[PDB]
Amino acid sequence: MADQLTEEQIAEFKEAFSLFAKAGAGTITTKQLGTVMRSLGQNPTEAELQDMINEVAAAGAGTIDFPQFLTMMARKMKDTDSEEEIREAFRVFDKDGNGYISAAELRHVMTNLGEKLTDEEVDEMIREADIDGDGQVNYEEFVQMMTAK
């Protein structure tokens, strides 16, 4: 099942994971894992790595293959289709048709579904987000503030 995906990564990703070790090749071990993941580029905290290295292990040794190595690093960013989906919702929110949500619009979505939600939370939300000092929020800050947890 193809769905379009970057390539520059898979290219360099394999290279590093391919050129390394010494007594053999094909896969890396816990220790070698970090080594390859390090030269790879980014160098965030080591916590995430630790857990993973111990999570991949399962019915077998600690040697990891390249296919699983990329899947993990790739999953780190979390892959989930949500483009058009959010776009559609964008139209439902905005009423003027543009690239910036306004209070009036936001309130509309609320009062519509009901759930009370007085106009108090609305102004409060704008005070929390808002990239600039504008009583409006761009599609970016909008999506960046959406998807909670």
């Binding site: 919702a89 979505v109 609320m110 579904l113 759930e115 939600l117 939300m125 959406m146 998807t147 909670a148």
Partner: peptide, 21 residues
Amino acid sequence: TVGKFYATFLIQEYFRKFKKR
């Protein structure tokens, strides 16, 4: 039915959550 139903699932979750102060 793949449609706007999904949009609700999203706006719904975020709402019920950020609800409290």
